[PDB]
Amino acid sequence: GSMSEQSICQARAAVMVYDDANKKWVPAGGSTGFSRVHIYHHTGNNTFRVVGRKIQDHQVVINCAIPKGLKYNQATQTFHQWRDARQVYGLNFGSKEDANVFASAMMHALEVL
């Protein structure tokens, strides 16, 4: 894990998931607050995943593969989102610098996949 994956970015964001049944965003992991969100590159397989942990209690709130061809939506300068076959994820970044860091890394991953 540490043997196989390298972080390519870390950004400060409140990680949300979309409750489509209720038509509203809810905090990932059930607890509002900011997380440190990484993109990890598994260099052996050339695969990537998003992993986020709450700053306070370190709970893992997001751990999702980045599939080839993903459409990454920069809705605003500080809120970005994407979806999989299961969930819609949203990142409410702590600053535009954090958003640029994460988007830059996500776009690199999507070029490299």
Binding site: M16, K23, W25, F79, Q81, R83, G90, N92
Partner: peptide
Amino acid sequence: XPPPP
């Protein structure tokens, strides 16, 4: 994609 919160 749904609207931001």
